């Protein structure tokens, strides 16, 4: 971000810096393919990267604003965040896991899968298909 552009149009907030990474950096040669995008922005990729950065809170906020419909997950994100990040509810974690296996596991947008898998610790057999790009 700290190098030309726009200089990004908006304020230097962390969120925008990541939007820049996702948009300017190599998610697009000349933009496209299989993300879920609203208003020109891959939300799931954003949450994933923000999470990658360590900005969990911001990632949570993005989800809140998201316009999505897996919303139960939204709940499970927030408490994961609230606690020590080992979100352990004696309650639902089990429920989240079932949904992952049935709905999410066989399908979806790579980043969405990443967020579910990583936050949830959903499927211990380990690896994320499309978006592991670095060692």
């Amino acid at each position: 971000v700290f190098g030309n552009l726009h200089q990004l149009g908006g304020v230097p907030g962390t969120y925008q810096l990541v939007r820049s990474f996702l948009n300017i950096k190599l998610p697009a040669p000349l933009p496209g393919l299989q993300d879920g995008e609203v208003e020109g922005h891959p939300v799931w990729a954003l949450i994933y990267y923000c999470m990658r950065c360590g900005d969990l809170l911001a990632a949570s906020q993005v989800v809140n604003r998201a316009q999505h419909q897996l919303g139960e997950f939204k709940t499970w994100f927030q408490e994961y965040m609230n606690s020590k990040d080992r979100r352990l509810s004696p309650a639902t974690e089990n429920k989240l896991r079932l949904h992952y296996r049935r709905a999410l596991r066989n399908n979806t947008d790579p980043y969405k899968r990443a967020v579910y898998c990583i936050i949830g610790r959903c499927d211990v057999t380990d690896n994320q298909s499309e978006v592991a790009d670095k060692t």
């Binding site: 419909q69 897996l70 139960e72 949904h99 709905a103």
Partner: protein, 190 residues
């Protein structure tokens, strides 16, 4: 009867079994207690659906029997009844009722069954609510017919009514005549 699933012949025995459970008081209740225990154990059998029904039916009755508190105090409801009944529902106890009802000694059968059907309303309402709430939450906003039907236990019950009652007005009147069924209808309307 187990050593029959499809065999229609099963219907012939339903009068005896329905009425038998209806008159559980006659048994002792050392015996009734023993049956109850054996049945909970018997949850092993999914393949026999009709075992599952009859047992579930017994439970619907047993709850009423426990009214003389000597029995009821002894038992814990969650362990003693709800857990088992719930298991039976999961094991398609409603589905087979629906089948019995849909695929309709007529007097004995109609009378005994309608007693069965009604017992379920009055004694069972906790189960109905449990299932209804379960169903509302379960599906999420590509559902296949099989997925739609899986959880459908409550609707199946409604159909049970529809098949059993159909024609038969006699029976049907019971719903309307006094303002628990009438409660049932109000409930279902919700």
């Amino acid at each position: 009867l187990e050593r029959v699933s499809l065999d229609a012949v099963n219907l012939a025995l339903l009068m005896a079994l329905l009425y038998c459970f209806d008159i559980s008081f006659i048994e002792q209740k050392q015996y009734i207690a023993t049956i109850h225990s054996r049945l909970q154990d018997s949850q092993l059998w999914k393949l026999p659906g009709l075992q599952a029904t009859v047992r579930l039916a017994w439970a619907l009755a047993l709850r009423g029997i426990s009214q003389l508190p000597d029995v009821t105090a002894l038992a814990e409801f969650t362990e003693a009844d709800e857990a088992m009944a719930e298991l039976a529902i999961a094991d398609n106890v409603f589905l087979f009722l629906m089948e019995s009802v849909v695929v309709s000694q007529e007097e004995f059968y109609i009378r005994r069954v309608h007693n069965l059907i009604t017992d379920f309303l009055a004694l069972m309402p906790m189960k109905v609510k449990q299932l209804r709430n379960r169903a509302d939450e379960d599906a999420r906003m590509m559902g296949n017919e099989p997925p739609i039907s899986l959880r459908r236990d409550l609707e199946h019950l409604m159909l049970l009514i529809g098949e059993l009652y159909k024609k038969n007005p006699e029976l049907a009147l019971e719903y309307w005549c006094p303002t628990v069924l009438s409660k049932f209808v109000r409930q279902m309307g919700d």
